[PDB]
Design a protein around this ligand. Structure first.
Ligand SMILES: CC1=CC(=O)CC(C)(C)[C@@]1(O)/C=C/C(C)=C\C(=O)O
Lengths: 542, 542
C-alpha cells in the first residue's frame, strides 16, 4: 500500500574512480538486473543505492520517491548481502522465530510476531524443510539453494518495499538458480515490490526473466533499457553476433572491449542517455526492554553453548584425567604431605588450563555475525555480552563438579560434608576466574591462532610462580606470584585440608597471604576480566 | 609419431546403474567434450575410459587402437583430475623440475630430464610466472587459472597421446575458461593428440571450440555427433528453441526432461546409434635407485619442514620459556635439592609435550597428495617414509639446542664442558624419542582432531607416573612408570647433576633403574615408534 520509485542521477565514486557517470530510474513492479564484468563496480552501485556508502567521496542525487535518502525511508529497504551468516544448530523454523522476535517492534503482541514468521515460511518454498537443522559444511543440514532462501526470509520479516540483493545465484546449480529467480520475479509482479539484483553469469532462460537491464564496463554505463530490445539497439550502432549465442553473453562481451568500447560510450551519451533525463518516560521502559532482549539471546545460544562445552572429545579428556587421579592417589594417607600437596597442585593446573584455553575461540568465531546483526537495530553490545557471560558460567560448571565428586572419595581427602562443599566452592570459583582470562585475550586480539599462543605463555608464567616448583623465589620476582590465579587457588586448597599446623606437626603448609584475602582476589579477577573483555569489544568502533 | 584411436562400445556400470548403454569412437586430432546434467554419470565415463574402473561391475569392450586396454598402452594416457594437489612453498619452476626427475626414466641424462621440464613451461603459458611461489589460500601465490595450467603440465612431461581431463574450467572466470580451452584445442590440432574433457556449463564461444559432443541423461546417451549439426539434428525430431539461446543450453535442457526425454532415447537407437556401429642383475641397481629417490624427496620437502618447524609462533613460545627458566632459577645454588629437581622436571615436561603434539599433523595433511603420487610410478612408501624421518630429525634439533645453551649458564648447573655435553645429549635423545609417539598416533588414526586429544591423554599418563608428583605409587601401578618416556629422561638428568650421593649427603636422588638401562630404552623407543608408524601406513592398502 506504499510504492517506491528509486531515482539516481549520480556521478563518480573516487576511492581511481570506481563509478563515473551512471544514471537511471526504477519504477514499482519492475525486476531489474545489473550485469557487467568482474571488477566493474556493479557491487558498488547496489551498495551505494541501498544507503551504505555516502559522505566522504560519493556525490550525487540518489533520491527515493521524489525526495531524499533519510533514516525514515530506510527501514523499508532490505539489502540481502552476498554471504550467509546463520547459526548451525538451530532449525529453519527456530531461526526465523528468534529473528522475528528481535526485528519486529515491541508494540505488537506475541501472537502476530510469530504469525508473521509463519507466512514468510510459506511465501518462500521453505515448508518441506522447516524442521531440519541449518548446519554448515561440518553438520549435515539443508542444501545450499535453501540457505540463500532463508537469508532472503531474514529481510522480508520487516516487509520491505525495495529489496536489493547482491549476486543471489552464485554457487547455485543450473536448476535452483532458475527457480530462485522465478520467485523473485513473483515478488515484483504479484506483490508490487522493486527488486534490484546483480547476476554474475546468467544462463539463457534466466535472462528471459528480466524486465530492465543495465551494463557497466569499469564505471560508465552502456545500455539502460527494457532488455528485450537490447539486441535491436546494438544492431543500430553496428554490432551483431556472428554465431548463435546467449544474449546475456554478447552484450557482456561488448563491455570488456572484445569486438567482432570506445564507440559504445560515445553513442550512449548522445542517443540514449538524454532520454531518461527527460523523465526526471523512557526510564522503566528501557529496563524491561533490555531484559527482553536478553531472554531471547539466551535461548538462541543455548544449543551453541551446549555443543561448545559438551563436546565428545572434551568429555573423554576429563574422564581420562579423573581415573588417573583416582588410581595414582588411590586410598591416600593424610600424614605424608609431599604426595598430598602434589594432588592439590595438579588440580590447580588442570582446571586453569582447560577453561582458559577454550574461551579464546568464543568471540573471533562470531565477529562477522555480530557486526551484521548489531547494525540492523536488533541488539546493542551490552546485551550480547551479558548473554555470553551468563550462558557460559552455567554450562562450564558441569564437568568440574563431576570430576571432583568421583575423585574426592577414592583418593581419601578430608571426610565430612563441610570440607567437601568448601573444596567444591574454591574449585568452581577458580574455574570462573580462569575463563575470564580467555575472554579478555580472545577479545583483545581477535585471532584464534595468535591468541592461543599468548594464553599458553600466560598460563606458563602462572604455573612456575604458583609456589610448588620453586621455593626460593630470587628476591626480584616475588611480586610475580601475586597476579597469578594458580597461587590463590592452591593456597586455599591446602588451608582447607590441613588448616594451620597443630595436627601435622617444612612450612609449605603454613601460608603467608591469608584465607579471606585469597577469596577476595578471585572475585576481583572474576569481575576484572569481564570488564577488560568489554572494553576491548567497545574498541572496535563498527 | 604414434596416434591413438579410442573405441568404446560398453554396457552398464551397476554399483542402480550409473551408465547403461553408451558407445562411440574418437579419432586422432579431435577435441571432444562430454556434457550433461549434474549427477548424470559423465564423471564415470571418463574415469572408466582412462582405465581406473574395471573388473568388478564394469563390462564392455573399451579397446585402445584396435586392441585391448593393457599396462603397456597405459603409460601414454594422462588423467588430469579435478582437484589440484601441489606443495605451496615451491616455485613453479621448482615444482616441475622435481616432478620431471621422478616421472621420466633413469636411462636419460640429467641434461634432457630438466630440458623436458623447460619446453613444457613454454608450451603452456607458464613463462611469466615461473618464479613466483605456488601457494594456496593462506600464502599469496599464483592465480587459480594457472594452478590448473600447472596440473596439466604435470601430465605432459611423460608426453601422453590421450589426455583425459575432468572439468578443467570449473571455478575459473569468464576469460580464463576461454583461454584454457583455446590452448587445449591447440594440442589436438597442432600436435595430434586426442583430448577428451567434460565441461560443466560452457558459455557460447567455448561451445564453438568443440569438434565432437556427447550428451548423457542418467545413463543412456542422446546424441554423439559433430556438434555443429546438433541443432540441425534435433529439429528433424521435432524440437527447437523458442527464444535466442546458447546452443549448449538447449540440448542440456533436453537431457533432464524439460521440453518446450522418452522420445529422445527411442529416436537415437533407431536413427543414429546403428550408424557409428558400422565403423566398428637388479641387485646393486635397485639400491642406487632407492637413494636417488631419497635425495630428490629431501630437497622437495626442505622448505616444508622449515615452515613446519620454524614457525614464528613456535619460536616465541621457546623464547618465552627460556627467560622464565632463566629468571625463576637465576643463580641457583646446588645444595638445596627440592628446587633443583623441579628445574629438571619442568624441562622433561616441556620437551616431551611440544615435539609430540606437533608431529600428529604431519601425515593427515599429506595423505591426499601421497596416494596420487604413489600410484603413478614415482615412489614407494619406504622412500617417502624415510624422507619424513630423516627430514624431521635434522630440523627439530635447533630449538632445544638453543633453549639449553641460553639456560644452562644463567641457572648455574654443573660447570665444565663434559657435564654440559651429557645434558645436551640426553635432551636431544628425549626429543627424538618423543616425536615418534606423535608419528605413531598420527599415522594410526589419520585425523588431526581425534589424534590431538589422544596424544594429550597419553602425555598426561606419562607425567603423573614420571616420579615427581607422587612418591608412593599404590602397589598396582608400579608397572605404569616403565613405559613412560618422561621417567627415563628425568632419572638421567638427576644422575648427571648429582651422581649417587657422597657429596649431597631423602632418596629421590638415588635412583633405582640404572644409567645404561635408561639410555637403552630410549633407543628402543626411538626405533620402536618409527616401526609402528610404518606398519600403520602399510595398513591403508591404497
Ligand atoms: C601434559 C598435559 C596435558 C594435559 O592434559 C593438560 C595439562 C595442562 C594438565 C598438561 O599440559 C600438564 C602440564 C603439567 C602437569 C605441568 C606443567 O605445565 O608444568
Amino acid at each position: 500500500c506504499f510504492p517506491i520509485t528509486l531515482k539516481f542521477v549520480d556521478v563518480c565514486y573516487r576511492v581511481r574512480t570506481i563509478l563515473s557517470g551512471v544514471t537511471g530510474m526504477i519504477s514499482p513492479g519492475e525486476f531489474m538486473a545489473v550485469l557487467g564484468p568482474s571488477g566493474s563496480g556493479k557491487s558498488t552501485l547496489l551498495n551505494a543505492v541501498a544507503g551504505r556508502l555516502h559522505g566522504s567521496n560519493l556525490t550525487g542525487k540518489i533520491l527515493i520517491n521524489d525526495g531524499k535518502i533519510t533514516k525514515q525511508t530506510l527501514k523499508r529497504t532490505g539489502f540481502v548481502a552476498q554471504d550467509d551468516l546463520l547459526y548451525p544448530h538451530l532449525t529453519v523454523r527456530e531461526t526465523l522465530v528468534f529473528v522475528a522476535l528481535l526485528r519486529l517492534p515491541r508494540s505488537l503482541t506475541r501472537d502476530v510476531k510469530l504469525r508473521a514468521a509463519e507466512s514468510v515460511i510459506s511465501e518462500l518454498g521453505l515448508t518441506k524443510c522447516e524442521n531440519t537443522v541449518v548446519g554448515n559444511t561440518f553438520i549435515r543440514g539443508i542444501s545450499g539453494g535453501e540457505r540463500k532462501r532463508v537469508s532472503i526470509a531474514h529481510e522480508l520479516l520487516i516487509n520491505p518495499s525495495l529489496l536489493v540483493l547482491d549476486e543471489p545465484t552464485s554457487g547455485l546449480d543450473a536448476t535452483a538458480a532458475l527457480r530462485l529467480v522465478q520467485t523473485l520475479a513473483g515478488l515484483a509482479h504479484g506483490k508490487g515490490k522493486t527488486v534490484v539484483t546483480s547476476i554474475h553469469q546468467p544462463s539463457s532462460r534466466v535472462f528471459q526473466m528480466f524486465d530492465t537491464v543495465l551494463l557497466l564496463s569499469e564505471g560508465k554505463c552502456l545500455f539502460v533499457g527494457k532488455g528485450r530490445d537490447a539486441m535491436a539497439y546494438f544492431e543500430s550502432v553496428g554490432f551483431s553476433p556472428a554465431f548463435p549465442m546467449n544474449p546475456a553473453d554478447f552484450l557482456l562481451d561488448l563491455a570488456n572491449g572484445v569486438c567482432q568500447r570506445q564507440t559504445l560510450v560515445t553513442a550512449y551519451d548522445t542517443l540514449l542517455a538524454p532520454q531518461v533525463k527527460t523523465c526526471i518516560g523512557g526510564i522503566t521502559t528501557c529496563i524491561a526492554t533490555w531484559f527482553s532482549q536478553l531472554c531471547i539471546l539466551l535461548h538462541r545460544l543455548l544449543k551453541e553453548r551446549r555443543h561448545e562445552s559438551f563436546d565428545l572429545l572434551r568429555i573423554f579428556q576429563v574422564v581420562a584425567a579423573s581415573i588417573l587421579c583416582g588410581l595414582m592417589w588411590w586410598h591416600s594417607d593424610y600424614r605424608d604431605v609431599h604426595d598430598r600437596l602434589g594432588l592439590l597442585f595438579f588440580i590447580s593446573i588442570f582446571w586453569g588450563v582447560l577453561p582458559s584455553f577454550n574461551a579464546v575461540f568464543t568471540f573471533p568465531q562470531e565477529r562477522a555475525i555480530f557486526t551484521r546483526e548489531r547494525a540492523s537495530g536488533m541488539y546493542t553490545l551490552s546485551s550480547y555480552f551479558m548473554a555470553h557471560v551468563l550462558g557460559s558460567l552455567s554450562m562450564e560448571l558441569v564437568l568440574p563438579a563431576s570430576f571432583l565428586t568421583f575423585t574426592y572419595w577414592m583418593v581419601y581427602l578430608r571426610p565430612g560434608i563441610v570440607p567437601f562443599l568448601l573444596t567444591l566452592s574454591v574449585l568452581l570459583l577458580y574455574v570462573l576466574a580462569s575463563q575470564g582470562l580467555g575472554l579478555a585475550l580472545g577479545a583483545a586480539i581477535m585471532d584464534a591462532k595468535k591468541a592461543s599462543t599468548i594464553v599458553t605463555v600466560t598460563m606458563l608464567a602462572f604455573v612456575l610462580t604458583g609456589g610448588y616448583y620453586v621455593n626460593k623465589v630470587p628476591s626480584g620476582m616475588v611480586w610475580m606470584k601475586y597476579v597469578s590465579t594458580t597461587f590463590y587457588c592452591y593456597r586455599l586448597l591446602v588451608a582447607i585440608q590441613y588448616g594451620s599446623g597443630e595436627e601435622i606437626l617444612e612450612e609449605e603448609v603454613i601460608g603467608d597471604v591469608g584465607m579471606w584475602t585469597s577469596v577476595g582476589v578471585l572475585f576481583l579477577m572474576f569481575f576484572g576480566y569481564r570488564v577488560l573483555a568489554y572494553l576491548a569489544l567497545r574498541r572496535i568502533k563498527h
